[PDB]
Design a protein around this ligand. Structure first.
Ligand SMILES: [Mg+2]
Ligand SMILES: [Mg+2]
Ligand SMILES: [Mg+2]
Lengths: 535, 544, 541
């Protein structure tokens, strides 16, 4: 009625596996990777049947690729790919590939229902998009190998080689739920060909793009746990999957809890004892002008601003020197809890300086929050142990700020790889001249931004191209196609204009003949095909 | 308890009510030329207790009226193959219908994510899913735009231009992806997922080629008619005015699965030499003794010459020409006037006449010329295609002949040929990128080519693969620049051009429907919300 | 380059639609349904092309069905269906149908990756499961209509009728994210055949089954907004979709924020000023590499004196220098209680008036490490939340740890006191041991009895799972022991004797239906008929 098992061999295999994992973790890949669980803990989570996900090889390829870039102080630069066509053409020029959540929202949801970048498509949407590209890469790699190996050695060496298998880094948004969600999301990403995934310290289901407004953060620890959870998943299912940690704390103005000491410096509160709960005041009025009045009266600021203000406008003898006692101990990076910072302020001034961040809460319950670049450095440093790349969303393409953040992070973790969003949400001809544009990536490369991506480039290139042709098409008919697309395709290298070959027809005619004993009457690229018009 | 009771009288009453509703439906001007081989009774019996109205049907109506006006004005609804929501959103500005390509779906949109050349060997639901992809995008952007408009004043509305996102979609059904029951289910999906019209081809499934690949196998005329009937049956049951397009690949095809249909017989190639035996079996015997490769192809090329392959009428003409007959030119004409591409004369009948006219049983064997798979050999051209066009026309709102080149003469031949017998038949034309277009035509002719075909009655024309190629060019070009000149490439090649050409997407937060959703957010949160997506801070104030 | 439009006809059509919506909303269906937006607001959200989702007809069918049940004080009782087989057989006996999230987690995730009931499958999982059943219902309805209408009137009246089209109510869990998520989730449910969906006041990152532990709640308002969002979606895309509101506050011990005044009564805090932040104390002990840790918590908790603020006020008065104590509690309790919605500031203010202390109370310090606040719900908390949701919800539902009649009455009475016409729903959970919890005489009548209290819709959530699980395990066992005899004996004979339609499985699956479609298209006749001479179902006549 059941199956028997050798209990001794069980333990033996368990122990064997524990050791295999310990050896795995000791590899150079994990040199900077903090793990808070044991190899024992992980082995227990695995099954009796080992599975090897090819995605992991692309993780390795990605890591080595980034190693060399870091050493040479140069950049793996890429952008957001839409579809199999993109990755097939990109592979000629670029050495990694970005799958964008923003683009997936508009073009690739698994319910087919589009949206703005809110990560409210179904969870499997981006994982499915990776497989979309993954499998295309694999297919075109397979096609090209057949094309090559049916040539002579003499002919091979003439015909160029494309590396279709560029590693993919994919948007995991905020992880699409709790820890168990994130494990399952990571599992899918691994199964469907992800070399690396990135994940952001926003609250789920308030999730914004990045250069949208009203961004809510989560406690530092909560997002650490997310990164741990990714790693836990990758450890169980056995991928060297790269983890990227993103922070939206440059611009964010809200946060879900005050629970984490590291956040306290940045939590905004009311200095005026007389101010009551704004949330409840609005609720009673509703059952604006009253808000803008309450805010002025409430005197909102960060607690240290409040301490400095007390000392500045106070009966204190040696004021400049007394700020510095406080600021040297209490600052963005200093991780000083609020109780602790109040205690010091009392020692230095003799007041319990009043501060209430409960009353400034939004109606949803979020606490108010003043991040900038230094907050982002704080969170960068915190994530760094858990994350192979670190990434700070910025409202502009500002070199100074990028340096501030890079310097800030590397001061505490000098070997940390950084990543930068080259966002089309910026107007790029407004933000800098073209001479600077050309060198901007390179310059950030020096600061240690080893991976950079234009998130929405695939969207926009396609959008321009289709709108432009549609316009021509409407005006001058088939001349538009000859002129705007097909001639240009021939004159530039573009492989797709011979689209039967590109799509893998001669590859499949191979499979057809092979199965039919060498010969077949229904050959797809035999005499008659209309691609002899492209010779 | 154990079951549910029903009024048997109300049942019959509702049945009869529905039968009448269907009869009234079928009598509408839409179906004026639409042959149906079943009764309204037959269809009503197939329906359920719960009526469902698929919005796709409204787009069918929109498509039919749109094509009516084009036919009347002798002008063209011209479009191309859309890839994704971005395409349809931008296309809607300029074009009035939309093509979903099976070829493109094979490479970019299979539901198994496994790409291919155009063999229709992705899973059946692949193109139906692609339509819904675009359908739902159309619906979404229509919804977005209506909110944008209706939160403006009447004064402001009238300044801001309107896009009709809801352009009717015509989608590739390949060869129907199996039998009759398959085709019903495939059509059902297309209707449910937003298809205004679908097209379907007289090739055999699972030998299915692109139109401009080689080794194309046809099916009997009747078999493909049954396919079209099956589409109509499905659309009738589930209640769509779905347009049906019939395609024939018989211009170029050289094979066919059966000889069963008398209409095909004229075109079936056979051996005139009694001495020639079964080629198929001869090859098999040579292969089993380990003759392979080019020495084997020698045996075929020898057998073919010896076998004297031709069409039976060529054989009759040949007998008379090289024969002891007095009045030869006049004797061919007796035969050709009775027996020709359009004449539907069976082989038995054509042999009988040849015997009357010559006194021979002229030898003809098309079994021996069969391919190893069992297909019969077949010599179509434009006239064969006209034959099949005419046959399909009763069952098909548009008719479509795949061509190896963009040849005006041939297009006229086919149009004239079909309209002679069915003068009110709408035609459709593939403006294929499988043609080299600067090799085939000068540019002056290019500009007017669509218009000229419009005169002949090609009311719907499409570039099948244009979406593929525009995207392919664009991404390759930018990737190249990007690799050479960094972020300057984006400023220069994409984003500036986007601003200058007025392309809506460069403001991509708005385009994607952020302000639309902020609407929904505030509305639900009682007017106000702290997490507004397009509030103060959004970086699209850099595009004002 | 664009399309022109009549600006006047635009406004006219807009206004036309606004009116159509206003008329729609005034129908008897919406008699108890609070809306916080205007018909103007909704019309603006719609597109130029109206779409009619058949699911909405099943919503109507469900509402009328429940109306009659409420009036007759009887119950629409059902359970959790797995697959097309279930709905096809259920339709004979039952009048509605439940699609379970729990079951979907184990059997029907769209990633095919199973799990316990954590709602961490992809969002479209349950919506897809409804369509699974929806389309089966529609198919078998279509099959049966053909079977009937190819009989004579004489023969029809002999052969029984099955109503396959039983309305479906489906698990939306906690909505699978924010407001925009919930709209999109509802849209899918409508498109895929949902008559009604239910939704729970748990946090999404932490979603438990109803009878798992460690349940985190969200603020009352937050879950109201969820229900509003469902309604907003249904209004835009034009369904009379029923909304069910669930509360897990009977058993839950945690909550994400204190922001909502209604919750304050129930938020647990420390009465001892000396107790510091438990969260941070644990963190400091853990970072030095400390069951010995759980010792530090259990010590801190005893020392901290955790309770609800009113317990703290009552305790002060009881053990205090006060003259008229019983009477002084009642001054507080009459003003401050589970249903009274009294904020904490307000309740402290009153306690000061009544005792002259600022009675110390700190609920920040008792927070879990994740940041959740501690929370003591029971049935009265659930009534509080029931009442709050009722305006927004066609049915109200309180998860319970046992099948206790008294508790069910407490909750029903409690809710109906303030909203007497509110329909209620009850989980008849297999998470209960049912032969341990009551005798069989009571079992038989338990549904009926709850029907009296106004529980008009009741469901066994996991019954489909368990019936199947028993059946397959039992047969597999027999099969393994006595071969094909097991099938003759355990399944196929019983199928014949019990009249189960599926044993003639070719007919049941709709073969004769499709042969119809085949012949019809082929001009009346076809050589490849599936149920022609040769089919081996003449062995079942
Ligand atoms: Mg993104
Ligand atoms: Mg195609
Ligand atoms: Mg459930």
């Amino acid at each position: 009625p059941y199956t028997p098992i050798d209990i001794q061999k069980e333990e033996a295999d368990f122990q064997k596996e524990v050791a295999e994992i310990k050896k795995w973790w000791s590899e150079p890949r994990w040199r900077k990777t903090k793990r808070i669980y044991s190899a024992e803990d992980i082995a227990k989570k695995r099954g009796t049947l080992k599975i090897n996900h090819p995605s992991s090889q692309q993780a390795d390829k990605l890591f080595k690729l980034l190693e060399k870039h870091d050493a040479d102080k140069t950049v793996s630069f890429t952008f957001g790919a839409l579809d199999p066509i993109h990755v097939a053409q990109m592979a000629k020029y670029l050495d990694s590939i970005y799958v964008s959540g923003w683009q997936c929202s508009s073009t690739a949801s698994t319910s087919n229902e589009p949206s703005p970048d809110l990560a409210d498509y179904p969870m499997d949407t981006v994982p499915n998009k990776v497989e979309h590209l993954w499998f295309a890469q694999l297919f075109h790699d397979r096609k090209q190998r057949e094309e090559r190996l049916t040539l002579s050695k003499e002919e091979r060496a003439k015909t160029p080689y494309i590396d279709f298998l560029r590693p993919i880094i994919a948007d995991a948004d905020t992880g699409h739920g709790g820890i168990t969600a994130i494990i399952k999301l990571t599992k899918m990403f691994i199964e469907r060909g992800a070399a690396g995934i990135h994940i952001e310290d926003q609250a789920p289901g308030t999730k914004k793009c990045g250069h949208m407004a009203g961004k809510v953060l989560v406690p530092v620890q909560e997002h650490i746990n997310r990164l741990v959870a990714i790693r836990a998943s990758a450890d169980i299912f056995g991928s060297n999957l790269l983890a990227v940690a993103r922070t939206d704390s440059e611009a964010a103005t809200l946060i879900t809890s005050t629970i984490d000491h590291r956040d306290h410096y940045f939590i905004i509160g009311a200095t005026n004892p007389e101010a009551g709960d704004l949330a409840a005041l609005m609720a009673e009025a509703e059952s604006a002008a009253i808000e803008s009045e309450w805010t002025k009266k409430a005197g909102l600021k960060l607690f240290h601003e409040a301490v400095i203000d007390e000392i500045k406008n106070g009966n204190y003898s040696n004021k400049d020197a007394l700020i510095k006692k406080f600021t040297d101990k209490v600052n963005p990076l200093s991780h000083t809890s609020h109780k602790e910072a109040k205690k010091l302020a009392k020692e230095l001034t003799g007041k319990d300086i009043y501060f209430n961040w409960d009353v400034a809460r939004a109606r949803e319950g979020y606490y108010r929050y003043q991040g900038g670049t230094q907050c982002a450095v704080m969170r960068g440093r915190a994530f760094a142990p858990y994350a192979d790349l670190i990434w700070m969303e910025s409202a502009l393409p500002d070199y100074a700020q990028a340096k501030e953040f890079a310097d800030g992070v590397k001061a505490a973790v000098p070997d940390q790889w950084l990543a930068y969003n080259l966002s089309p949400s910026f107007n790029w001809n407004k933000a800098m001249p073209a001479d600077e544009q050309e060198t901007y990536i390179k310059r950030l490369g020096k600061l240690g931004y080893v991976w950079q991506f234009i998130t929405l480039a695939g969207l926009h290139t396609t959008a321009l191209a289709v709108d432009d042709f549609s316009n021509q098409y409407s005006q001058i008919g088939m001349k538009a196609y000859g002129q705007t697309v097909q001639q240009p395709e021939i004159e530039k290298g573009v492989e797709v204009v011979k689209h039967q070959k590109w799509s893998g027809a001669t590859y499949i005619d191979g499979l057809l003949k092979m199965v039919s004993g060498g010969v077949t009457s229904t050959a797809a690229m035999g005499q008659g095909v209309t691609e002899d018009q492209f010779k």
